[PDB]
Amino acid sequence: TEVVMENVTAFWEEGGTPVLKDINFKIERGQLLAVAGSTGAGKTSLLMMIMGELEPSEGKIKHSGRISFCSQFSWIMPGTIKENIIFGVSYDEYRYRSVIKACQLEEDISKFAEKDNIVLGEGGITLSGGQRARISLARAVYKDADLYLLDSPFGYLDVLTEKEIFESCVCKLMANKTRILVTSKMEHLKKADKILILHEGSSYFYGTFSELQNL
Ligand SMILES: Nc1ccn([C@@H]2O[C@H](COP(=O)(O)OP(=O)(O)OP(=O)(O)O)[C@@H](O)[C@H]2O)c(=O)n1
Ligand SMILES: [Mg+2]
């Protein structure tokens, strides 16, 4: 067992309404959990509990090891595209290349005269929303970790590009890794080992896509 929540209830504000209520799930090592639900349902808050920024008022939580987190809000720091993706981690050519390929960034990078040394975040290039999202995803995936927390990482991408990168990056490149993906897309829920649908803090559904189909 790699990540467990058992009867978890939590509050952002003392005496407030709970942001998560009686949440239950289990992820085995190397599995994929999809976390879905409407705005404000508590999906990012769930990831924050795993990262220790939100403590449970009821229930138990299990997780161990290093975390790599991809925010739903893409970001860039001043530096090259290579520096933004490696972001202080040791460099390896093969690992870097495999990530940028899985994230479709090789096409973008190949069009620049400076290639991977193009400078971002310093007033030169203005990246599109989808470029910034794929760079942010690549940064999180390049980091070596035991658990990957990918919070709606496909912002600004069209549905086919999102499908392709879900398959090449989250399913293929990351096949051996424990992953929690916040996402609402049907194919992602179908390919996940488990699905957790949140609604106003509560567990709307927890199980497999197959079990939901059977209902
Ligand atoms: N520091 C915080 C973070 C969140 N919240 C509240 O906790 C609820 C859930 O927030 P969040 O987990 O961020 O919702 P998401 O499910 O991630 O919504 P979205 O899809 O829009 O990202 C919201 O009512 C939000 O106002 C809060 O009070 N204080
Ligand atoms: Mg969120």
- Phi first, then psi: what are they for 180, rounded to 5°? -120, 120
CB-proximal residues (5 Å) to ion ligand 2: 44
d(CA 199, CA 23): 11
SS3 144: coil
Maximum CA extent, the chain: 57
Tell me the structure's resolution in angstroms, rounded to a single decimal.
Answer: 1.9
Q: Is 39 annotated as a binding residue?
A: yes
Q: Is 37 annotated as a binding residue?
A: yes
**How buried is 121 (Cβ within 10 angstroms: 0-12 exposed, 13-18 middle, 19+ buried)?**
middle
Q: How far is the CA of 12 from the centre of ligand 2 (A)?
A: 14
Q: Is 16 annotated as a binding residue?
A: no
- Phi first, then psi: what are they for 150, rounded to 5°? -105, 100
Provide CB contacts within 8 A for 182, sequence distance 6+: 34, 35, 36, 43, 44, 47, 72, 150, 151, 152
| Among 148, 143, 146, 142, residue whose Cα is nearest residue 96 | 142
List the residue whose alpha carbon is closest to atom 2 of ligand 1.
12
List the chain gaps (C–N > 2.5 A) by preceding residue: none
CATH number of the domain that residue 73 is part of: 3.40.50.300
Provide CB contacts within 8 A for 26, sequence distance 6+: 1, 3, 4, 194
List the residue whose alpha carbon is closest to atom 14 of ligand 1.
40
Domain range spanning residue 99? 1-215
Q: Which of 8, 9, 19, 149 to mutate to test the pocket of ligand 1 (most atoms within 8 A of CB)?
A: 19
d(CA 133, CA 166): 13
List the residue whose alpha carbon is closest to atom 29 of ligand 1.
12
Distances (CA, A) of 166 to 15, 18, 24, 63: 39, 32, 25, 24
What Rg, from alpha-carbon coordinates, does the chain have?
18
Identify whether the C-beta of residue 70 lies closer than 8 Å to the C-beta of residue 143: no
The count of structural domains within the chain is 1
Pick the atom of ligand 1 nearest to 41's CA.
Answer: 16
Distances (CA, A) of 99 to 43, 79, 144: 25, 18, 12
